[PDB]
Amino acid sequence: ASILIGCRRAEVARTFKEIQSLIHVKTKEFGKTLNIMKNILRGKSQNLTYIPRFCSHLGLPMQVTTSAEYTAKKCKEIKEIAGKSPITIAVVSIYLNILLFQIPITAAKVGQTLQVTEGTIKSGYKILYEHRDKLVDP
DNA sequence: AAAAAAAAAAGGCGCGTATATAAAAGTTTCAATGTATCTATAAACCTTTGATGTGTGTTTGTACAT
Numbered sequence: 001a002s003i004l005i006g007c008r009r010a011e012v013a014r015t016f017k018e019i020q021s022l023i024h025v026k027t028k029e030f031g032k033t034l035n036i037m038k039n040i041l042r043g044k045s046q047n048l049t050y051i052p053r054f055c056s057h058l059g060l061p062m063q064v065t066t067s068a069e070y071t072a073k074k075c076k077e078i079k080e081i082a083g084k085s086p087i088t089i090a091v092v093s094i095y096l097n098i099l100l101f102q103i104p105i106t107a108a109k110v111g112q113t114l115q116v117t118e119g120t121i122k123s124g125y126k127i128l129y130e131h132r133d134k135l136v137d138p
Numbered sequence: 139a140a141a142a143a144a145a146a147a148a149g150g151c152g153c154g155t156a157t158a159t160a161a162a163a164g165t166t167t168c169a170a171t172g173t174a175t176c177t178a179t180a181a182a183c184c185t186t187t188g189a190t191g192t193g194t195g196t197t198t199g200t201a202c203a204t
Contacts, residue, residue, distance in 0.1 A: 031156065085155090 001034045005041075013049035015087050017115060048072075050090045057113060058094070064101055068093040071135050080127055083120070091116055092124040096135075 003022075007014050020027060051072060055065035072093040075082070083089035091114055098105045111118050 027155075 001030060001037050004034065005037060008046065011049075013046050014053075015050065047086045047090055050087060051093065054091060054094060054114060058105055058110075060094075060098075060103065060105075064094070064097050064103070067097045067100070067135075067137070070137060071096055074135060075128075075131065080131075082124065082127060088116060088120040089124055092121060092128060095121055095125060096128045100135075 004014065004016070004019055016027065016030060019025075020030070048069070051068045052065050055062075055068075068090075072090060075089070075093065075096075076086075080089075091110065094105075095107070095110065107118055107121060110116070110121070
């Protein structure tokens with residue numbers, strides 16, 4: 001966690017699974033340890049980071065990533081709490097925007113590359129195949 | 139061409155993700171303690187090898203038949 005602290009506190013945010021890949025922490029000993037730790041400094045006293053690191057993991061040009069910052073922020077800004085650990089609803093912006101482009105990143109390839117449920121995608125994409133109205137920049 | 143068995147396939151059961159509440163029982167993990175088991179190691183013997191007083195040995199002088 002002090003890494004996840006040290007990471008996020010250094011303005012680089014990584015998912016719990018990502019560190020879990022580095023160290024298997026039973027995903028639970030992580031959580032309780034984090035809460036105290038954060039409050040350790042508070043007494044001693046940001047999911048945006050995920051959009052680009054994902055695009056590169058798929059090897060995409062900047063525009064597809066460029067757009068998602070607008071889309072995810074705009075999808076976040078109005079409504080759609082949408083997600084229970086917004087890690088997922090980040091990726092759907094790529095999926096939203098990758099389909100706005102025509103580049104083969106077929107859902108199955110997305111999943112294992114980013115180790116995400118496929119179900120959260122399409123249902124997450126439900127709120128997108130309907131919200132396709134206001135993301136028109138050009 | 140027809141009969142029988144397993145898979146293709148999904149949605150949901152039902153509690154892992156938190157999650158704090160508290161008691162109730164028990165486990166495992168950690169560390170001090172105890173012990174036979176490696177090892178060197180210097181202190182045991184045995185043998186070796188260089189230095190060593192000296193038993194035997196070359197000159198002096200001898201009672202002693204010859």
